[PDB]
Amino acid sequence: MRGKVKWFDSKKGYGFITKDEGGDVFVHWSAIEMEGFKTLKEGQVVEFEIQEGKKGPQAAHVKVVE
């Protein structure tokens, strides 16, 4: 539901995130797609979820926190 932020790319929600006290994730642009305040400073705590399938775990829902 929340992690840390390490990298933001793409004009939408692309980049790399860090789960709470875990490791690092990835993000595509449809996980950091909000209409309030989405950007990822690359060094904060976010409010997200992650799903792992045939590939690797990526953020699907990405909000911002500190």
Curated annotation (Swiss-Prot):
UniProt cross-references to CDD domains, sorted A to Z: CSP_CDS
GO-annotated cellular components: cytoplasm
The keyword Cytoplasm is annotated on this UniProt entry: yes
Record keywords, A-Z: Activator, Cytoplasm, DNA-binding, Transcription, Transcription regulation
One Gene Ontology MF term: DNA binding
UniProt-listed PROSITE patterns: CSD_1, CSD_2
One Gene Ontology biological process: regulation of gene expression
Keyword Zinc carried by entry: no
Domain of life where this protein originates: Bacteria
InterPro entries cross-referenced by the UniProt entry: Cold_shock_CspA (IPR012156), Cold_shock_domain (IPR050181), CSD (IPR011129), CSD_CS (IPR019844), CSP_DNA-bd (IPR002059), NA-bd_OB-fold (IPR012340)
All copies of domain CSD, residue ranges: 3-62
SUPFAM superfamilies: Nucleic acid-binding proteins (SSF50249)
Subcellular location, record wording: Cytoplasm
Subunit structure and binding partners: Monomer.
Name of this chain's protein: Cold shock-like protein
Source organism (scientific name): Thermotoga maritima (strain ATCC 43589 / DSM 3109 / JCM 10099 / NBRC 100826 / MSB8)
Annotated gene: csp
